[PDB]
Ligand binder design. Structure first.
Ligand SMILES: O=C(Nc1cc(F)c(F)cc1C(=O)O)c1ccc(-n2ccnc2)nn1
Ligand SMILES: O=C(Nc1cc(F)c(F)cc1C(=O)O)c1ccc(-n2ccnc2)nn1
Lengths: 176, 184
């Protein structure tokens, strides 16, 4: 049940705040900042849900075919006593054969780091961590399916390694 | 178990990251004479834990005697696929009789908003009583986490309070000043 609460926490504390302005920020980037010949940034927030709960800080460290392109225009807002809290979301090019194949706003679901931290060493086994990660994912899918902030503007990317993270994301980008 | 998990998720997801550099950033802010002449910033992160789980976005809206002053210079770092994620931490003056009595880095514990959002509308008997119990468990777990955590080196003060029914009888600025004066 901890992961059910973490999924709610992620929606209430982050996704409900970030999803409503996302379309407008992507449109700003596409119309004002993006070089003439660069491909458009895709319209969705792509959230990585590694079922192993491995959340590295740097996506280019995780797969060099995920290349940092630029920041979205920043979203600021008062939040829980932070005046003008800053959200500096990252845009990535997904490379195939050294060339851009897709461009998107991509990040990991941060609460998966809690499940990982509490099970990295051996109570709370790897199998228990997998079960919590799946519960997180199922709970978050149910929340977003019902949430008025989720309007074809978010895509959950849940995966288990048996692998290219870039190819996993591209399969989701190309399903749209 | 949810409150226990939220306390861990708050330490792992934020306090672990923000606490190690915080005193260096405050020290830097206080070394600017024009800042120090206004008043020294207290050398701790003060975390508000309203046990009702009510977490308004703007502290001056909560209590006009909590006056926004300034921001620490941004801390950036790569986090969970966010390149150079930005932490803009707010500094407040705490007023007594219209005058500065203290200056601090102050914010609400964000996961208390989840406890609240999940029970605000409940028609269950004892939903408010159950929420208060969850909030206390959250605070207890977080106190126990930070007692043991190497990032917590007399640099964090949890401010847990249950507000009275009577809105006018409670002053959040006074609640923070009580803590700020002990930390001194
Ligand atoms: O997951 C986040 N937040 C939370 C998750 C919780 F479960 C919770 F209880 C509270 C929060 C919170 O932030 O208060 C989160 C994720 C990405 C970014 N972000 C993206 C660009 N810059 C910052 N910011 N926050
Ligand atoms: O509580 C926060 N975050 C989280 C809490 C979680 F429970 C979790 F699982 C993940 C996060 C997360 O951020 O990923 C949080 C609070 C303050 C600020 N902040 C202060 C200035 N600018 C930004 N940022 N984040």
């Amino acid at each position: 049940s901890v992961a059910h609460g973490l999924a709610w926490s992620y929606y209430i504390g982050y996704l409900r705040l970030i999803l409503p302005e996302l379309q407008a920020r992507i449109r700003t980037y596409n119309q004002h900042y993006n070089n003439l010949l660069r491909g458009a940034v895709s319209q969705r927030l792509y959230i990585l849900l590694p079922l192993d709960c491995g959340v590295p800080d740097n996506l280019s460290m995780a797969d060099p075919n995920i290349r940092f392109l630029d920041k979205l225009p920043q979203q600021t807002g008062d939040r829980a006593g932070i005046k003008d809290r800053v959200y500096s979301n990252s845009i990535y090019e997904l490379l195939e054969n050294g060339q851009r194949a897709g461009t998107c706003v991509l990040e990991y679901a941060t609460p998966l780091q809690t499940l990982f931290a509490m099970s990295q060493y051996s109570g709370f086994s790897r199998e228990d961590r997998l079960e919590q990660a799946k519960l997180f994912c199922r709970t978050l899918e149910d929340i977003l399916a019902d949430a008025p902030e989720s309007q074809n503007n978010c895509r959950l990317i849940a995966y288990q390694e048996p692998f290219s993270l870039s190819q996993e994301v591209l399969r989701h980008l190309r399903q749209e």
